[PDB]
Amino acid sequence: TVVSVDKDVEALSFSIVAEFDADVKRVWAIWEDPRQLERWWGPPTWPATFETHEFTVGGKAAYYMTGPDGTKARGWWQFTTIEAPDHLEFDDGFADEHGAPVDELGVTHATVKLEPLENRTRMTIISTFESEEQMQKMAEMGMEEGMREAIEQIDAVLSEPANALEHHHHHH
Numbered sequence: 001t002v003v004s005v006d007k008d009v010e011a012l013s014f015s016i017v018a019e020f021d022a023d024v025k026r027v028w029a030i031w032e033d034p035r036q037l038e039r040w041w042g043p044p045t046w047p048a049t050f051e052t053h054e055f056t057v058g059g060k061a062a063y064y065m066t067g068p069d070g071t072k073a074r075g076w077w078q079f080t081t082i083e084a085p086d087h088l089e090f091d092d093g094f095a096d097e098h099g100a101p102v103d104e105l106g107v108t109h110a111t112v113k114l115e116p117l118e119n120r121t122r123m124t125i126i127s128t129f130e131s132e133e134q135m136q137k138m139a140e141m142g143m144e145e146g147m148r149e150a151i152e153q154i155d156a157v158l159s160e161p162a163n164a165l166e167h168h169h170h171h172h
Contacts, residue, residue: 058080062099080109105138
């Protein structure tokens, strides 16, 4: 899906609203299970792979997005607030070939909120950046668009039609 996309540069936040036919724990399962997270983490062309995923308050996660050419782009993750089954908070971090925080792109704190629609659930992920010139550079990378494409591939995780996704996503 992705039913709405909101961006506020004054408050340094970038929110994506999406709505899925599943319960709050079923949509939470993509966050709780490392294997179900890397299933959609990053765009269709760059699927991630989590070496570790603690999923605890003050715990971390290590991953890398495997490119279409094989180009391996590392990233690091840190959990700040895990309430369950609705409220989650963490920090999306990029990592270089050694695993150091990419100061080119900085650090961004995303807040995942699940809403019980009886038999369905709506998710809203708000990524907050350290500065304006940082969040402009995130938009220059196209991180905001590729993030949406990841959340549209969540629909492929929770539905899973007859192939999940053959990479038919051909539009920007």
